[PDB]
Q: What sequence folds into this?
């Protein structure tokens, strides 16, 4: 695994020893090459895992997340090139350093054979994101947003640490392989109930769970474009990955303890999809859509059936790509209009036709149009839920209908109708933005050809 | 339908329920009780694989009709005779079904008449 | 791809004889087809097999005994 | 006399059936005149800024920003715990959760019992 | 290529109320003491090729004559051919 | 009622400006200055590039790759009627039970 | 559409608008032209019998019963001209309307085609640049203190002046740009 | 479409045609600049009827606010030309 | 002529444990009868559109 970690570390001295006007080119080229190298982790086994060493191991759940993490950095650099133009070389190098450190921590987090090492890196990712949000955000609310994004996380994560060390004091190890092979049932006890809660709540808060989702709209709205991209694409999936790893020690207590979270997610997906219908801000609408999709992923993980896990993996990958694309489109509009109010700039199809095509395809993938991987994950989760209980179909279908409604509402409001007359600074789309949009969308339509790459270890 | 008016506006016990027909023994009327005759066997009627609801006592004419259509593919109009033979057999089948309906209706009439005559005799 | 027909402003529009002859031809073809089918195939509309009268069936063939035999 | 039209929330009263327009007064006329004055002043400011050849951007709209700020950021500082607010929040935020919990719990208990007696007919049920 | 022929309007004195339903409209209007001032503006709808009308059944029987003739010729030829 | 004199004058001036703009929207005889630069026959070539090549590719793919695997193409087991004979075996299906033919 | 609205509609304007609406809806009811002409002459007669009423209270009690009767018998599916706000081709060609400023973003290779058009466009832009400076002063001096009362604009007064705020009325895209 | 690009001459001729077919006006005294209220002695009901005739003859609707201040055939022609963007 | 019927499962897409998903076409009476009708109607529609949507 060092053949990916070491180049990502070398990205830092290369960035800091670069010319003042070569940082973006060098960073983009070498991050793309690192993505290409990481692409060879996809050759997974039907047996246990790719156990590289005592410290790092790869799995067909970890490999798609690793590849998406490596692929996201070049897109983040391309998106950040525009709004950082008027800023000094040292500060741009610091921004690229924060992005590189975030990638390094995420890469080490997804392999992380140890649960304490996983926790340490899973919490180390917090610092670069907070600095990016509270340093290079625009509005005055960013500081407040950062505070939320901080404390919520720690409010969930501090009990987990205690639980973790407690387990190693009883089991003797926190290695995931030993934990899986030596797993034992949890008796229905108050102590075991609180151990279950301490294990679950940390990952629940970062999905986020419906009741615990307040930090996400603030953090995603006030963050710069690279921050929003990394928050929606990779950082939300840490909770799902952690739950998928940790639910192996929580059986059979998950059967009883899953009910409040299942109800919260099943009702909150409807609530947040309905919230999307009445939203005056593009970024907030995209954030609430992310909350709905992650609610579906929470349901899938809580059901803990093979089809549930496959659907959850597919949906995590598809949502990451789609939400990053949607945020990039919103930012392309914002850098022209500087308002971030959906109703202000209207009828952009007549002025930006190719960008309108990008908007249409992004809305189509968000709408879960078959045979996209978005719908593959959606349908697998829905079928698993139907087997779990036939009444889930009402909530699932209502969520599908509202999702289509708000996706097409977002498309029609911004692209169709009549152009706003007083806005005359809508310049033609740059090659950088179109390239960014294509680099988001072609991986999705190309992954629909080989779904088993993103269906997880239970395929 | 006229039968519906006599079963919905008149007496329900006067006329049959089409679901439960017949309600009387077959050989009740006359002791001959001839059997129905089937020409197509199991195997050929399976091999032609007509339809489950086409697998009735009219199957042989359908077999002939199907064969005629198949041989004369270009001249679709040529096999007029096969169609007539098949619809005539279906007409006979439908006439027999109507005869069963009328038969059971008359038997119901006679049974009601017998019971009312017996009741009159007993009360007298 | 058509012919040049100028506006008219409150008279009957100009008509080519081609469209008139085609419309008349196709109307006549439709009526001829209807007549030809009716002549050759009248039973597709009127029916071929007479409907039996259930009240005309004798009590013998339906197995009815005069209320005392069985 | 003809049948009377009864207005509703989603089918409002027509302008030509409004009794207020038929009841004219000098105060009503001056109110209309000064409403037109406000509208004309706003229109003049907008068109003066709109036709300007030097302007090369979005014309800032205070009304739109007031709308968005009121919709998003003015809510909580103007919130008070009130019997209406408290009961509505409790109902609309708890009742659906417990209702769905009851429904799903009853369905799953019935399913589990039926599996216990074995009278579910789970034949060909392979994928779950 | 477009329709550039310099179309000239017809004479305005051409249109009359006489011989149209506008005539009986004017008659019934005069029975109560009124007049129709826009009658001649609508006379062109009853004047030229629009003067003659066809019934609904007549519209249905658009090509019955020549189709019927084709039918009778065909049936006679078939009767002559099969009687051989 | 009617226009005030100022309304007439403003409408007339705006009308003249608008008509001059509309006239200026027209194209000169050379206006599309195109920059030129390079580096049964129609039906016959169309029926080759759009019918013959796709059917060749699809027939090759079906006959040599799809049919290679079992159960990929499954047919209907054509209908067998009395009096028919079979190519593979050569035996003749017996006729039916000589039902009475009358009307 | 073009004309600036007033603060209110006078009684005569209300009566004339009701006359037009009732005639249009009667035309919707009376499909044929002769029947429509007869009933429209009757309708005009029924308007005319109270043309000379001097009592404003009487005239206002009228037009009210009249609009109530109209709302009762208003043909819930009236005929609409296709380009009218309720027609079947109302905003059909708005997607083809492109603003004129977009031409400023064209590539020089695109402007190499159509050179005469862009020369005339440059002339128009220069005219706008000078006329705007004249227009601002003229509007400032002509507007009454405290702000405008009606959104009606004055014409040009001098020889070389252009009507104030003329650019976006003169440079409309077209009724059917494509 | 194939609709001819109508010109000012056609609009003027068609407006005068519709007006001469209005029998409350004598055609020989009619002129393009003749006022409806005073030069021809027409009531405002006649004016709205004339507007309706123009609408029905050109196939589009003139709004009440614009229609109620059109008092000459010439300015009716000008309004139609401005609405339809006629060059000459 | 014959009544010929096929299933053409040409491309095998993902397999889900005991469930196999493949690109399969059903070529029964309904498909082979409806396809020519739809193609004929669409051909007429496109020829009509060449005139209706010319502008
Ligand atoms: C259907 C068969 C197609 C075969 C031909 C091959 C086509 C390959 C396309 C690959 C993907 C396209 C790339 C996306 C970006 C588009 C690039 C662009 O800007 O165009 C510029 C280019 C130049 O135009 P321009 O004038 O310069 O630009 C003017 C404006 O942009 C205005 O431009 P516009 O108005 O023309 O719009 C652009 C166009 C293109 O933009 C798009 O919207 C394309 C993306 C649509 C998908 C949305 C996501 C949903 C998930 C679907 C996943 C399918 C992918 C399959 C695997 C793909 C491998 C990468 O959008 C549309 O026209 C809307 C089409 C809606 C289609 C919805 C149906 C989806 C399911 C269809 C069946 C798929 C499975 C079949 C299974 C059974 C059969 C085997 O335009 C094009 O070339 C059009 C692109 C082709 C149309 C795509 C429609 C169907 C293709 C589906 C994907 C491949 C199917 C594989 C099956 C083959 C058998
Ligand atoms: C502009 C108008 C169109 C012009 C172009 C016309 C041509 C269109 C044709 C292309 C689309 C039509 C679909 C037809 C697909 C043909 C190719 C396909 O069959 O191959 C696929 C093969 O492709 C791969 O399966 C999918 C590609 C994998 C995508 C990886 C993403 C690239 C990395 C980018 C970074 C990652 C970002 C996202 C993180 C998760 C599936 O093959 P498969 O039967 O299975 O096995 C392969 C061969 N074997 C048997 C020898 C093994
Ligand atoms: C706010 C946004 C979302 C945040 C996250 C919300 C999710 C948290 C929900 C916690 C999951 C369940 C907690 C406890 C489940 C135990 C089962 C219990 O509910 O059922 C009865 C439990 O009975 C009563 O609940 C006893 C406890 C009563 C006191 C609890 C307080 C009630 C409301 C508190 C909710 C506040 C949550 C937030 C706290 C800050 C059954 O009684 P019994 O069969 O005999 O004993 C079963 C347990 N044994 C077997 C181990 C002995
Ligand atoms: C084009 C011009 C070139 C012509 C030369 C090539 C002629 C054909 C020879 C091709 C060689 C045969 C071949 O393609 O190999 C089989 C290979 C499949 O790979 P296998 O490993 O064998 O099985 C699949 C699972 N592993 O077949 C192909 O890929 C070619 C044709 C595939 C089918 C067409 C796919 C089109 C639709 C794209 C996918 C759409 C999304 C999925 C829909 C899901 C529906 C349930
Ligand atoms: C987003 C903000 C959420 C904040 C945190 C939410 C998670 C809360 C989970 C509990 C926190 C601490 C739990 C302890 C960690 C696990 C350790 C463990 O399981 O050991 C138990 C110990 O169990 C405990 O001590 C639990 C005590 C909990 C005290 C703190 C209560 C915090 C609030 C309680 C109500 C809310 C609970 C769920 C909240 C969910 C989040 C909203 C049994 O060990 P022994 O006692 O040694 O062996 C038994 C024989 N003696
Ligand atoms: C078929 C759909 C339903 C139809 C039902 C509607 C029923 C409507 C009939 C009601 C009768 C009325 O007129 S309602 C009576 C309203 N009041 C008056 O008429 C008083 C003075 N009249 C005017 O002022 C007019 O404008 C006039 C002088 C005519 C022209 O003026 P010009 O000189 O400035 O053109």
A:
């Amino acid at each position: 695994m060092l053949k990916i970690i070491i180049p990502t570390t070398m990205l830092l001295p290369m960035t800091w020893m670069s010319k003042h006007n070569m940082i973006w080119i060098n960073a983009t080229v070498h991050s793309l090459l690192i993505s290409l190298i990481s692409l060879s982790l996809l050759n997974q086994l039907g047996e246990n895992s790719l156990n590289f060493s005592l410290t790092f191991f790869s799995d067909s759940l970890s490999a798609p997340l690793l590849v998406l993490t490596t692929w996201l950095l070049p897109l983040m650099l391309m998106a950040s090139q525009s709004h950082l133009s008027k800023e000094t070389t040292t500060r741009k190098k610091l921004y690229i350093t924060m992005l590189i450190l975030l990638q390094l921590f995420l890469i080490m987090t997804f392999t992380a054979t140890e649960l304490i090492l996983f926790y340490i890196l899973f919490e180390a990712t917090l610092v670069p994101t907070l600095i990016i949000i509270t340093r290079w955000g625009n509005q005055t609310e960013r500081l407040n947003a950062g505070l939320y994004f901080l404390f919520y996380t720690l409010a969930g994560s501090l009990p987990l640490l205690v639980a973790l060390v407690y387990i190693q004091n009883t089991t003797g190890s926190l290695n995931f392989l030993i934990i899986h092979y030596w797993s034992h049932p949890l008796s229905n006890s108050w102590s075991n109930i609180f151990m279950w809660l301490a294990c679950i709540m940390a990952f629940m808060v970062k999905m986020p769970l419906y009741g615990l989702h307040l930090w996400l709209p603030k953090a995603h709205v006030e963050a710069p474009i690279a921050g929003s991209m990394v928050l929606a694409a990779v950082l939300l999936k840490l909770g799902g990955y952690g739950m998928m790893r940790i639910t192996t020690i929580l059986n059979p207590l998950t059967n009883y303890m899953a009910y409040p979270f299942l109800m919260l997610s099943m009702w909150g997906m409807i609530m947040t999809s309905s919230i999307c219908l009445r939203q005056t801000d593009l970024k907030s609408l995209i954030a609430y859509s992310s909350v709905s999709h992650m609610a579906l992923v929470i349901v899938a993980i809580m059901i803990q059936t093979p089809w549930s896990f496959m659907g959850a993996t597919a949906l995590m990958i598809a949502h990451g790509l789609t939400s990053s694309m949607l945020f990039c489109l919103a930012n392309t509009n914002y850098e022209r209009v500087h308002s971030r109010t959906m109703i202000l700039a209207r009828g952009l199809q007549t002025l930006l036709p190719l960008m309108a095509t990008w908007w249409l395809v992004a809305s189509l993938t968000n709408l879960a149009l078959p045979p996209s991987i978005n719908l593959i994950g959606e349908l697998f989760i829905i079928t698993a839920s139907f087997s779990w209980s036939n009444i889930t179909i009402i909530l699932m279908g209502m969520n599908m209908m509202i999702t289509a409604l708000y996706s097409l509402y977002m498309l029609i409001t911004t692209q169709r109708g009549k152009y706003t007359h007083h806005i005359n600074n809508i310049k033609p789309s740059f090659t950088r933005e179109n390239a960014l949009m294509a680099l988001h969308i072609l991986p999705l339509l190309l992954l629909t050809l080989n779904p088993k790459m993103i269906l997880g270890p239970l395929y | 339908g006229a039968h519906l008016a006599r079963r919905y506006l008149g007496d329900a016990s006067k006329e049959p329920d089409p679901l439960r027909m017949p309600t009387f023994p077959p050989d009740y009327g006359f002791p001959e009780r001839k059997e129905r005759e089937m020409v197509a066997t199991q195997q050929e009627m399976n091999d032609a694989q007509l339809m489950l609801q086409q697998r009735d006592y009219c199957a042989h004419y359908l077999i002939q009709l199907l064969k005629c259509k198949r041989d004369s593919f270009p001249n679709f109009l040529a096999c007029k005779h096969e169609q007539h033979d098949w619809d005539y057999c279906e007409h006979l089948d439908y006439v027999k079904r109507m005869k069963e309906f009328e038969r059971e209706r008359r038997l119901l009439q006679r049974k009601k008449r017998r019971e009312q005559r017996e009741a009159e005799m007993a009360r007298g | 791809g058509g012919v040049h027909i100028e506006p008219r402003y409150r008279q009957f529009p100009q008509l080519t004889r081609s469209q008139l002859i085609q419309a008349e031809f196709f109307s006549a073809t439709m009526w001829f087809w209807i007549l030809w089918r009716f002549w050759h195939d009248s039973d597709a509309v009127l029916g071929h097999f007479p409907y039996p009268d259930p009240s005309q069936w004798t009590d013998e063939e339906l197995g009815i005994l005069p209320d005392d035999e069985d | 006399s003809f049948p009377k039209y009864k207005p509703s929330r989603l089918a409002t009263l027509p302008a030509t059936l409004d009794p207020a327009e038929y009841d004219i007064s000098p105060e009503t006329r001056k109110a209309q005149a000064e409403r037109l004055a406000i509208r004309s002043r706003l229109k003049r400011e907008y068109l003066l800024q709109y036709n300007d050849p030097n302007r090369l951007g979005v014309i800032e709209d205070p009304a739109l920003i007031r709308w968005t700020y009121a919709r998003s950021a003015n809510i909580y500082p103007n919130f008070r715990p009130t019997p209406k607010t408290s009961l509505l929040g409790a109902l609309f935020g708890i009742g659906p959760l417990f209702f769905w919990y009851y429904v799903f719990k009853t369905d799953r208990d019935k399913k589990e019992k039926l599996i216990q007696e074995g009278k579910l007919d789970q034949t060909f049920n392979i994928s779950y | 290529e477009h329709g550039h022929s310099k179309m000239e309007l017809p004479d305005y004195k051409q249109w009359k109320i006489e011989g149209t339903p506008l005539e009986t409209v004017q008659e019934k209007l005069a029975a109560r003491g009124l007049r129709d001032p826009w009658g001649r503006n609508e006379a062109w709808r009853y004047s030229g090729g629009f003067a003659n009308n066809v019934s609904f059944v007549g519209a249905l029987l658009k090509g019955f004559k020549w189709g019927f003739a084709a039918f009778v010729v065909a049936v006679g030829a078939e009767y002559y051919l099969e009687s051989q | 009622s009617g226009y005030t004199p100022d309304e007439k004058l403003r409408l007339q001036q705006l009308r003249e400006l608008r008509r001059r703009w509309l006239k200026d929207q027209e194209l000169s005889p050379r206006e599309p200055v195109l920059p030129p630069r390079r580096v049964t026959y129609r039906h016959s070539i169309f029926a080759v590039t759009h019918v013959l090549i796709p059917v060749w590719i699809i027939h090759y793919y079906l006959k040599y790759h799809v049919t290679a695997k079992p159960y990929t193409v499954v047919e209907r087991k054509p209908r067998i009627f009395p009096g028919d004979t079979i190519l593979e075996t050569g035996e003749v299906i017996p006729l039916m039970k000589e039902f009475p033919d009358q009307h | 559409a073009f004309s600036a609205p007033a603060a209110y509609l006078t009684h005569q304007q209300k009566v004339l608008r009701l006359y037009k609406r009732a005639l249009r809806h009667l035309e919707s009811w009376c499909v044929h032209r002769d029947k429509y002409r007869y009933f429209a002459c009757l309708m005009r007669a029924r308007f005319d019998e109270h043309k000379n009423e001097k009592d404003m209270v009487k005239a206002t009690q009228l037009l009210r019963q009249a609009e109530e009767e109209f709302w009762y018998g208003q043909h819930p599916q009236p005929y609409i001209f296709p380009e009218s706000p309720g027609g079947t081709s109302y905003e059909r060609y708005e997607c083809y309307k492109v603003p004129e400023w977009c031409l400023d973003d064209w590539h020089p290779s695109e402007k190499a085609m159509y050179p005469d058009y862009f020369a005339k466009r440059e002339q128009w832009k220069r005219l706008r640049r000078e006329s705007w400076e004249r227009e601002v002063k003229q509007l400032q001096e002509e507007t009454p203190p405290g702000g405008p009362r009606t959104e009606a604009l004055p014409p040009a007064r001098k020889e070389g002046d252009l009507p104030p705020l003329w650019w976006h009325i003169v440079t409309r895209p077209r009724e059917r740009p494509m | 479409s194939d609709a001819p690009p109508l010109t000012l001459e056609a609009i003027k001729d068609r407006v005068l045609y519709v007006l001469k077919l209005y029998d409350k006006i004598d055609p020989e005294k009619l002129s393009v600049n003749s006022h409806f209220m005073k030069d021809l002695g027409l009531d405002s009901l006649d004016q709205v009827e004339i507007i309706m005739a123009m609408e029905d003859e050109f196939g589009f609707e003139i709004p009440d606010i614009d229609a109620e201040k059109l008092m000459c055939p010439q300015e009716i022609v000008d309004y139609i030309a401005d609405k339809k963007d006629v060059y000459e | 002529h014959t009544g010929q019927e096929m299933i053409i499962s040409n491309w095998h897409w993902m397999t889900l444990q005991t469930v196999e998903l493949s690109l399969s076409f059903k070529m029964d009476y309904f498909s082979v009868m409806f396809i020519p009708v739809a193609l004929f109607v669409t051909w007429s529609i496109m020829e009509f559109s060449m005139w209706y949507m010319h502008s």
Notes: Helices of chain I lie at 29-52.
